[PDB]
Design a protein around this ligand. Structure first.
Ligand SMILES: [Fe+3]
Ligand SMILES: [Fe+3]
Lengths: 440, 440
């Protein structure tokens, strides 16, 4: 039986957070065709590590930046490597997932994506997508607490997938996000979240600004050196969580958001993530942006979007921002906690993007061969500028004002005209990775 | 203390199995300097999966094919991505490794490579490389039995590393190989070897020709479909061993070598591996060689070399070839057990390599940008021609005579002038991987 949920159709003139120029005629038709092909044909996971399908992200971000049909076609073709046949659905597995104990038991296995997708499309057909999201992420059941930890997995890819689904109110894409969240392999971050939150709610831990928690991670040798360069995509699971889970959980417990603090906590987390990207440069080297710090920035727009959902309690919004800010510390550790300095972004001189404004940089991004991360980071940075409107740099807000566009320029300048593997440095704290980077 | 073992000096006439032209003057001095630099500066593992450092393989193979200094420098620069800083040695761990229970206990952890290297260099300094290899692979201690399974790990890279060391009688390279063997992460192949051998020695399993065991793997649906395309580097651990270990153990138990069978078993295993490579083609597609089948052929020369060692008993030689032939069945399964047909290699018309002899193919391979697999597969095929001199195709020997060189031509034609990722098909049985291969 075909479900109306399985049909992804964007209609009306909503073109995304941080949108500037409207896409020219033809773009929406192209977007709907490609989003549906990707939905129907392709799995969420194309390899065991760092194998998230970015197709939907690249399409929606290029549309939000005002890309034409041909720019969307480029985005789709550039993500050919992310596109592999979707796994066969086992319909008796899908029936059995109604049982919360079987639902939980089958989580954290990549090969279950297509079974969770059918399950969530059926549930969303029966209830709204809103009711299903509350049931499976925010209802405090054993299932939903596991799902909430899973949401941040793999440097925030489930969060990003559900984010887009919620942003465009696309039921089928919300199903993609929930199924991604359920199936994502575990980095042993759930006990990090549980231990950090317990300490945070105990009354034994005084809050501290996030900027100081980045510093504690760097200054704490056991934590800074927990990850190893050659652990690659499993640095969090085998390093930070393997060796220092309790230690970094105690640091993370110090990130505590007051009941009126949701907006400021989004700016604080986003500003620190942006500081990460801009601030981890080396003397005598061209600017490069850390691949992981870039995921910390791209995911920030989805905290802003979830924050404006009327069906979601303020306390759940705050909880999302707390957990994201705490895992930002883990990703900072996994890059070997590089020294950050406000000087690099302040002093940065744009090259390829010299003299561009947002509209010209958006345009330049729509035509740039890329897997979608460029469009995603520049859109997050435009949105951050609006979120943090009238907030200036302070001891606790390291990036603000003209900083947001400067980082977008740096991300464009340091990735344009390069093959994918050369675009982003894979852990700015590891000295050896800077020997493969150009000297000024 | 500096060990004499730590210094790699290749001196004098010996230039490798299947060698033809002598390298011109200057090459030996370049080879010694680069082999030493790689030995002292770089780890064995540069990422957690498919992360083996091929630098020593690419150098020694290019030398054996008669490459000059410039060709060896090319080989070294092409393997730049394989070259990351060698791990800090813990000297108290090194002293503890003399205890066989601590030895066993720290096995199968990649980050121990440098610790096992220093241990094996100290032991080889004291006793000689030959005594240390017998002790740690062939003495049937607990440690040696675990090391013998590890030898075949990651599609034969420890076997290859040790093989080169034994071939050039290079103490320090023997130590690299034994340390690689100890540290390699486990794919759950040890229980496969144990189960297959217990069945073979039981008296209850009749021997069958290897080519009929490839057929049985293909024709047993539970074995053929155990591996999944998107399991990628972990198809063996999570697919063939995860789902079908007992099943494929029972097939592999039928490969049994009699006490006078060593030479014919090397020829049989090498011929079935070559047949894998040349025979897994598709109608209407350009020829491509499977990456894993290529590893099955390149490893085959090191069985021939181990077979000629005076210090190793015939029993042990026979046991190596048995285990290798049995695990070739597992790698065949992991590529989805593609249909094989002798017609493809029989009918193949060389393109780039048309009209070349071995000397000209060797010369062309010395200059081809590559990570070392091209030089390794063409040398194993030349050596296979020598090993199998006077053996013709039969019901059990599916490739012989002119087929060895014809496969070397196909490997050259199908990989030359392509970037590394386009060179070898990563599982010839998976229909989807052929949609990215050029049509005729
Ligand atoms: Fe990503
Ligand atoms: Fe290899």
């Amino acid at each position: 039986t075909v479900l109306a949920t399985s049909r992804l159709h964007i209609e009306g003139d909503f073109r995304g957070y941080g949108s500037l120029d409207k896409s020219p005629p033809g773009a929406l038709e192209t977007l709907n065709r490609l989003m549906q092909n990707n939905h129907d044909e392709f799995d969420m996971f194309w390899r065991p590590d760092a194998g998230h399908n970015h197709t939907a992200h690249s399409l929606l971000s290029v549309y939000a930046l005002g890309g034409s049909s041909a720019d969307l076609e480029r985005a789709y073709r550039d993500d050919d490597p992310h596109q592999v046949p979707i796994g066969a659905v086992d319909h008796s597995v899908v029936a059995s997932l109604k049982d919360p104990r079987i639902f939980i038991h089958r989580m954290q296995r990549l090969d279950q994506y297509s079974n969770y997708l059918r399950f969530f499309e059926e549930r969303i057909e029966a209830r709204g997508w809103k009711a299903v999201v509350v049931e499976y992420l925010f209802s405090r059941s054993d299932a939903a607490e596991a799902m909430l930890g899973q949401l941040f997995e793999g440097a925030y890819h489930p969060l990003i997938q559900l984010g887009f689904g919620i942003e465009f109110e696309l039921p089928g894409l919300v199903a993609e996000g929930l199924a991604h969240c359920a199936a994502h392999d575990a980095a042993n971050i759930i006990p990090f979240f549980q231990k950090a939150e317990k300490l945070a709610k105990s009354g034994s831990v005084a809050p501290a600004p996030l900027v100081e928690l980045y510093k504690e991670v760097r200054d704490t040798e056991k934590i800074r050196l927990a990850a190893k360069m050659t652990q690659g995509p499993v640095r969090v699971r085998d390093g930070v969580m393997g060796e220092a889970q309790d230690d970094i959980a105690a640091v993370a417990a110090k990130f505590q958001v007051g009941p009126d603090g949701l907006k400021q906590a989004i700016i604080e987390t986003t500003s620190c993530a942006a500081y990460s990207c801009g601030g981890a440069q080396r003397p005598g080297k061209v600017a490069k942006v850390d691949f992981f710090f870039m995921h910390m920035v791209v995911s920030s727009i989805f905290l802003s979007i979830l924050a404006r959902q009327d069906w979601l309690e303020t306390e759940d919004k705050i909880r999302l921002v707390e957990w994201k800010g705490r895992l930002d510390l883990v990703w900072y550790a996994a890059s070997s906690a590089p020294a950050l300095d406000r000087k690099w972004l302040e002093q940065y001189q744009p090259t390829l993007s010299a003299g561009m404004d947002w509209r010209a940089l958006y345009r330049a991004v729509t035509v740039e061969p890329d897997d979608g991360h460029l469009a995603k980071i520049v859109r997050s940075l435009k949105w951050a500028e609006e979120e943090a409107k009238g907030v200036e740099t302070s001891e606790t807000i390291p990036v603000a004002g003209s900083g947001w566009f400067k980082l977008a320029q740096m991300a464009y300048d340091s990735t344009a005209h390069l093959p994918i593997p050369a675009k982003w440095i894979m852990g700015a704290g590891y000295d050896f990775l800077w020997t493969r980077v150009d000297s000024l």
